[PDB]
C-alpha cells in the first residue's frame, strides 16, 4: 500500500487529492486528475541488486489545474493505521505504527492514533481508492502468475482516559451498550 | 497509460481512536 485517491468523480472534471508514498518522501497533490479505473504503482525485482524497485506510475493518464502540493517524510506482522477526515476545509490524517502477531484479524487492545498532518486542501470528497504496488509478474498477458481494512467514522461521544504522560490508554464508546453509557 | 486489471468483515474491537485535538491533558478522563 503506497497511497490513496480522495475525490468525487475521480476524473478530470473535478479536483482530487492524491497521496503517494515512495522510497524517499510523500507527495500530496490536488489537481484535476484523470485517474485510471485500476490505478497502481509498478514495482519490479531488480535481479542484480536483488531488491524491489519502482518502475512507472499508472495512477492517472493526465493532471492539470493543480492548486496544492506538499512534500514530507514517508510513512508507508506490521500494522499501519490511518484516519481520514475532511472538516472545515482541512483534510486531517492521523496515524499509528504498531508491530503485531496476528494474521487474519485486527489486534485487540487500545492504541490512539496521533495527528500526522493537517492539510489545507478545501475540496469535496465522497469516494476514495487505495493505491497498491503491483509486482511486475502480475502484468503478464496470461491469466496466471495486498490486504487492508476499511471502516467508517460516526458522530459518537467518547470518554478518553489520559495517563500521567498524556497518552490515551483507554476509551469508552458511550453508545456501545448500557454499561458504557 | 492505464491498465485494465479488474477481473469479508473483521471486528474493529476498540481501535480507530485518535487524539481529538492538540491539547495536552494528563491523569484525566475527558469526554
Amino acid at each position, epitope marked *: 500500500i503506497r497511497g490513496w485517491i480522495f475525490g468525487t468523480t475521480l476524473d478530470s472534471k473535478t479536483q482530487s487529492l492524491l497521496i503517494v508514498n515512495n522510497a524517499t518522501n510523500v507527495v500530496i497533490k490536488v489537481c484535476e486528475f484523470q485517474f485510471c479505473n485500476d490505478p497502481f504503482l509498478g514495482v*519490479y525485482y*531488480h*535481479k542484480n541488486n536483488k531488491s524491489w524497485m519502482e518502475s512507472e506510475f499508472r495512477v492517472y493518464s493526465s493532471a492539470n489545474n493543480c492548486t496544492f502540493e506538499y512534500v514530507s517524510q514517508p510513512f508507508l506482522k506490521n500494522l499501519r493505521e490511518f484516519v481520514f477526515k475532511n472538516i472545515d476545509g482541512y483534510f486531517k490524517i492521523y496515524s499509528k505504527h504498531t508491530p503485531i502477531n496476528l494474521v487474519r484479524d485486527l489486534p485487540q487492545g487500545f492504541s490512539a492514533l496521533e495527528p500526522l498532518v493537517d492539510l489545507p486542501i478545501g475540496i469535496n470528497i465522497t469516494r476514495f481508492q487505495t493505491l497498491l504496488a503491483l509486482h511486475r509478474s502480475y502484468l503478464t*498477458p496470461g*491469466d*496466471s502468475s495486498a490486504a487492508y481494512y476499511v471502516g467508517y467514522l460516526q458522530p459518537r461521544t467518547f470518554l478518553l482516559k489520559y495517563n500521567e504522560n498524556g497518552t490515551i490508554t483507554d476509551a469508552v464508546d458511550c453508545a456501545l451498550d448500557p454499561l458504557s453509557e | *497509460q492505464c491498465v485494465n*486489471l479488474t477481473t469479508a468483515y473483521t471486528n474493529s474491537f476498540t481501535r480507530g481512536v485518535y487524539y481529538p485535538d492538540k491539547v495536552f491533558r494528563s491523569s484525566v478522563l475527558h469526554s
Partner: antibody, heavy 117, light 106 residues
Framework: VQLVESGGGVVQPGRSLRLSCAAS????????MHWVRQAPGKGLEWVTV????????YYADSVKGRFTISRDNSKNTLYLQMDSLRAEDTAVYYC????????????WGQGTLVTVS | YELTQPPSVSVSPGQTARITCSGD??????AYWYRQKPGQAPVLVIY???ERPSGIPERFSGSSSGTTVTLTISGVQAEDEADYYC???????????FGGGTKLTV
C-alpha cells in the same frame, strides 16, 4: 499446441489487410498472444500483444494507431487488423503464445508473409 | 529498453561460441535467447538468463553480469549455424524487445 497463421498477401500502400491465427491443443482463453514480424534480411520485431481476456492490448510505436489486435475466445482465433499499410511493413508475421507466468514466447506459428507495394 | 548484440560471431566446429547482448534493461530484468534457422520460427534456447527448456541440450548455457548477458554454446556443430536473438521486456509489461540478432558462423 499448434498455431496456424493465414490471411497474408500482397497489397498496395494505404490499403488494409487482416491476418488470422487459429489456435489448437490448448486452452486459448487462458493465454495471452503476440504478433512478431520479421522483414527479409532483418531481425525479429515485436508488433503487438493481447491479454488472455482481451482486457489489455499494447502495440509497438512503429505500428501504433494503425494496427488493431483482437481475439475471439469462442473460435480459438487471434486476429490482427492492419490498416494504412506502408512499404516498410513488408515482413513475415508470426503469431506466438505468451508463456504463462513469464515474459517470453514459448510456442510459435509458422508465419505468413505480408508484402506492401 | 534497447538490446544491443553483435551482427555475427565466427566459431570453428568444436569450439565454444559466446554471443553477448547488452543494455540497461538487462541489469534489471531477465534475458531470453532464441535460435532461428532459415525458413523456421524462432525457438527458445535459454530463459531467465541461464535455464534451458527440455528440448535444449546441455551444450547451451547462459550467464549475466551487470548490463551484459551471454549465451554460451560449447562443442559448436554445423547444426548450430543459426541466427540467435536476445529478448526482454519493459518494467510495466507494455513492450517487448528483441536485439538485432547475431549470425553464428560455424
Amino acid at each position: 499446441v499448434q498455431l496456424v497463421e493465414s490471411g497474408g498477401g500482397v497489397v498496395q500502400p494505404g490499403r488494409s489487410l487482416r491476418l488470422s491465427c487459429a489456435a489448437s491443443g490448448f486452452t486459448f482463453s487462458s493465454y495471452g498472444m503476440h504478433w512478431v514480424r520479421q522483414a527479409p534480411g532483418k531481425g525479429l520485431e515485436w508488433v503487438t500483444v493481447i491479454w488472455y481476456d482481451g482486457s489489455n492490448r499494447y502495440y509497438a510505436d512503429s505500428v501504433k494507431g494503425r494496427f488493431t489486435i483482437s481475439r475471439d475466445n469462442s473460435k480459438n482465433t487471434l486476429y490482427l487488423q492492419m490498416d494504412s499499410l506502408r512499404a516498410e511493413d513488408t515482413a513475415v508475421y508470426y503469431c506466438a503464445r505468451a508463456v504463462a507466468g513469464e515474459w517470453y514466447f514459448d510456442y510459435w506459428g509458422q508465419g505468413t508473409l505480408v508484402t506492401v507495394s | 529498453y534497447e538490446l544491443t548484440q553483435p551482427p555475427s560471431v565466427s566459431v570453428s566446429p568444436g569450439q565454444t561460441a559466446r554471443i553477448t547482448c547488452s543494455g540497461d534493461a538487462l541489469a534489471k530484468h531477465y534475458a531470453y535467447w532464441y535460435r532461428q534457422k532459415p525458413g523456421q520460427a524462432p525457438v527458445l534456447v535459454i530463459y531467465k538468463d541461464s535455464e534451458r527448456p527440455s528440448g535444449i541440450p546441455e551444450r547451451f548455457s547462459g550467464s549475466s553480469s551487470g548490463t551484459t548477458v551471454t549465451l554460451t554454446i560449447s562443442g559448436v556443430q554445423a547444426e548450430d549455424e543459426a541466427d540467435y536473438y536476445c529478448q526482454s521486456a519493459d518494467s510495466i509489461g507494455s513492450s517487448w524487445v528483441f536485439g538485432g540478432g547475431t549470425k553464428l558462423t560455424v
